[PDB]
Subunit: 383 residues, 4 copies
């Protein structure tokens, strides 16, 4: 009955995230100019530099330094005092074009037959634990780093620096949340404020306002800047890389994962598109009330348009025998490369925004919408 589950999240000022933002910042710029572009951009970030590389084959014309400097700038690093500075950092580029060998298998004569960008498996997930049908732990962790960033930008706590990470562990009894045992919040700061003050301030401004007072009890344990000092952060304190936040980007470790990153790749890359499409049916199934929680999983083969595997897991919480529930899935949605792109209209520059604070949970994203639910209901005991 009782058990503990822990999830974590990172601020937009976290090295790894900086990468993602940059990566997806480039794609957006590119896509704005050419929707059918093929972008596979990987970014490396350290002490005084930013490396934007990979393979890009587009007709668009973009400025990497500008997109980069501007992207970091917005993140927050604008002075050597914080360790990194959009204005004075180095911006390197090693961007080649996509291999034709791969391309022949992706873009074929007939657009519909067009194949998967690569082989691989993706996991979709949905749960009635919350309104947005997302697990609770990841939702609150995200809220924590997000708050910290907002209290920093609005000038509430001017001594806060971009870099920050958050961890929370919930108490789960009878399969439901009963509270929160431990809370972790690490945030970069200036040489001007003291630990205690900082700690005491983080509680009032960042934790207390975000964590439901009900789940907080005299038992909860708070871990704030444990090493006792976090003045050095960002790429200086930790190397940032693209696609190294795979889990916080998705469901916090509650659901499963195939190993494919999101940022830097255009929709023809199943790692991102098939993933989104998977959250789409999973969420839609639960909204449709066909199950309380279900994990979906598709797998593909490079240059091949038709999915190599599909499986729905409802953990017994289903309301219609999986059978019809699985035959309904391939019945209603098109998981073929050039079916999901139209299904969710992925040919637009809407990904940068997705690079920090979770790819799921934001109802305004095309894959968060639940329109097929009611119709997915009709296919089984409408009433």
């Amino acid at each position: 009955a009782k058990h503990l589950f822990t999830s974590e999240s990172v601020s937009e000022g976290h090295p790894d995230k900086i990468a993602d933002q940059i990566s997806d910042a480039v794609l957006d710029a590119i896509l704005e100019q050419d929707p059918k572009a093929r972008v596979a951009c990987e970014t490396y970030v350290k002490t005084g530099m930013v490396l934007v590389g990979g393979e890009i084959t587009t007709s668009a014309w973009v400025d990497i330094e500008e997109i980069t400097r501007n992207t970091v700038r917005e993140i927050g690093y604008v002075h050597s005092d914080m360790g990194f500075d959009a204005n004075s950092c180095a911006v390197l580029s090693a961007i080649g074009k996509q291999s034709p060998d791969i391309n022949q298998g992706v873009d074929r004569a007939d657009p519909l037959e067009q194949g998967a960008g690569d082989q691989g498996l993706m996991f979709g997930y949905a749960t009635n634990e919350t309104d947005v049908l997302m697990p609770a732990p990841i939702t609150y962790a995200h809220r924590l780093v997000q708050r910290q960033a907002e209290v920093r930008k609005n000038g509430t706590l001017p001594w806060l620096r971009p870099d920050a990470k958050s961890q929370v562990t919930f108490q789960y009894d009878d399969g439901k949340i009963v509270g929160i045992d431990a809370v972790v919040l690490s945030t970069q700061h200036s040489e001007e404020i003291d630990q205690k003050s900082l700690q005491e301030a983080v509680m009032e401004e960042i934790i207390k306002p975000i964590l439901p007072a009900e789940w907080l009890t005299s038992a909860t344990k708070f871990f704030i800047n444990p090493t006792g000092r976090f003045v050095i952060g960002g790429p200086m304190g930790d190397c940032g890389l693209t696609g190294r936040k795979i889990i916080v980007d998705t469901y916090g470790g509650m659901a499963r994962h195939g190993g494919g990153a999101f940022s830097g790749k255009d929709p023809s890359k199943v790692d991102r598109s098939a993933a989104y499409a998977a959250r789409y049916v999973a969420k839609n199934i639960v909204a449709a009330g066909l199950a309380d929680r279900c994990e979906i999983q598709v797998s593909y083969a490079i240059g091949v348009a038709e999915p190599t595997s599909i499986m729905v897991e409802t953990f017994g919480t289903e309301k219609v025998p999986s059978e019809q529930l699985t035959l309904l899935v391939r019945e209603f949605f098109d998981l073929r490369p050039y079916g999901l792109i139209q299904m969710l209209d992925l040919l637009h520059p809407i990904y940068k925004e997705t690079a920090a604070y979770g790819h799921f949970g934001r109802e305004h994203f095309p894959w968060e919408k639940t329109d097929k639910a009611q119709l997915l209901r009709d296919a089984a005991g409408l009433k």
Copy 2:
């Protein structure tokens, strides 16, 4: 009852893996000279270069170019013909030292009290699906890319190139394997051989000898180099990065994951050490026969030595009420930073070997050993 599950693996010639190998190749070298070194090494690999960076604080003296060139060389790329060459590629370095701010929370006066290298959560897993208590899908996928590499090196198929990826999906009925529906195998090759021949050869030499003939039926579907052409590969066709094989490195997507990569980090980094220790108790629990399959999860807080969370999931397959099963865990093993390192003796250069073909399944690894099982048995109905 019936459902499909897919996993995947990559050859030691895959860009991402090249990174990991390099990353862990540097640490080993360093560790050989200094076991208590603090290594956080991230590698970026593309068309004609290799970028080794991150933060390293050691008293050891190593040669990055030599370790790198040699590491790639062994992988296989030794001619421009294959796209990359250990002898003629560029070797770049951006390696700083570890932030003292982090260090004060890690290495404290008392070695026992020494804290976790970072915050985060890790997932351990074990299953009686196989002798090594590893899931089957990931085990066979690894075997496929591994075979390909060996048939290449031994000269059986001299036209094979280092770069290769493998995907397999099993049929699961009644919770057990009944067969394999689809098989995917992509391998780089020379301009000298044709697709058909290649395909036909891959079956005889790499697939047929590795996949159990029982699970192969007239239904199984084989996908071999689908785009129809894979002559261009390695960093030229795809950017390689450290820690982007998170899932194939562990359990193939069968179990869960927290988001911590392994390669490039010394044991004081819970991402690698708490992870290993988690596979250790999970495996040891199943071996101890206390459960058919169980997932373990620990989470930590930077600078803090005592785990912030622990949870054992046996999916009902447990044989002793979880209660005593969870109280036994913290009873037998020490998950504190400086407890797992001694527990598994992680202060040695034994990681490079772990950078390709799974971190689990190799019984000779200290975390694969099951010595505590029988003793973990004594603590519950010995007999």
Copy 3:
């Protein structure tokens, strides 16, 4: 009366020249699209990479990788066998925009008033030692490396590699050439041919056909691949950088030099335009017969249109008192930034061609033409 003077040259396959070529290759491409572009391109070349950086502010849209790969390709390195490969090498870019602080001083309201791109001094030179009014030592050294490159491309000596350097020292008595004391010729080669053969072959194919048989006597000493082995070359054997061939680029050490490189910069950069204009008047003066040999020198001040200094040196060989000869100079030519560009029509992509084998001596270059001579004659005892 008697004395020895030595000059040297380098093949288009030399690391430093590779840089130059690349640098000026980028400019041309840019200029083709925008003649008034401001290009300050510096290239770094090593083992498996090429670094193109600096500051560029243009409205043009160019592809660095393509321009670079193609430029190296043409030079000759196309296989790992030779140490570098246009197809498999890395291409990096760190190009920012020109500082507006400099720009306000360069481009002012009135185009004529437009100022010098930087401060500095430049040396022009001319001599009746040869038809093209160039010194002899530098002329023959260029010819040597140029021949080696041609005998390599035409397939005469297929085992020759791109990298090569040439050195010649002439005997000067009575102020004229009497012969050549020592000849140096170093060229990269394949593991297939032996030293002796190579040496013997270099004489017949490269040295004997280029050096006048009259100046070659039993005294002359030949130095061919002295270390006894030159199989390793190019960026692998030596780091290439832009603007490190300052002297072979001009007059071989016979005349003076101020320190400004040529490649990578647009004409608004006095280092290149004022230099060219200087060879222009010096050559024109000797052609006009006003002197047998004269060195010119101008100096500028950033943001300032009017030259800070001008001086003509005729080494006594003048035929009209220097006085009128110097008053004639500023009388006939316009050395103001926006006067020399029109004077020589420098807003065109004509520089790559100038990046190897000398910037002077090629009569088809705009600064090699002598049209003002006859008119420079009228201004002094026409007849």
Copy 4:
């Protein structure tokens, strides 16, 4: 009789010089540990990075980041406010080992026979225009940038930034100096001070105290920060590269040059050692009173110990027929690779100090000493 000659210099804060300093800073460190090390270190410096590369073969163990960060730190860039920061900039490394092919020709069995590091020609120079037998123009220009640097460090003009360049043109009549026509002084500054103030301040603190009041007349023209604004400088405003200050490093353009840079290379490199040895005999000749001014020139052939060419030019100012003056040269000094190093005791870390403000003119340098003069006198009309 009358004519104008211009020279220039650059502060230790100039991008190019930053490179040199870095380059020679690495050598010294290495040499300190191993005098017979072979170092060919080329540095590239831009906006937020520093690239140290080339080929180094030593038994020494050094820290590039530390040597670099510290070297830049001392120069002065320590805040993003000035555009570059030693603490937060990137430090990259691409250092391979020296090609054995070259080595066999350099270090042979017999140490005496040991050969020249490369082919090439070098120019030495001396003049009685000044006590240190250096030309005047380059001496004063160096003094100008050197003053600016000192008035910045001592806090006299706290708003001064590291980057600065200086230009001076002298009036030469009857072959002697009569005065100075134009003065150029460009220095980077803070957003806090205005142009007029700055200009007025630069005259009092930097120009007036350094330029002889005799040579300054109502005619002299002063050019101070002409573009009207120099707030942006350093690698941000201009790319820094090693060996691009060839001329200011030596004689300001008064004497000739062969094209060989000094910084980053050990003494076995004739570009630096033969160069120094050339200033040594030229200076010593004039000190010996054998000529008022003389230019020396040697040339070498890779792997070859014996110089390929030697020539002394006294411009008629000699006092003993050149003949005996040239036979005296090879009589007194040893220009063989392994003769000059002992001659000047070059196996020591004494080069960093030589990377800013001229390689000649500092009488405490081993090549600035004149001990052979009196003995060079005995060999010709002692009395």
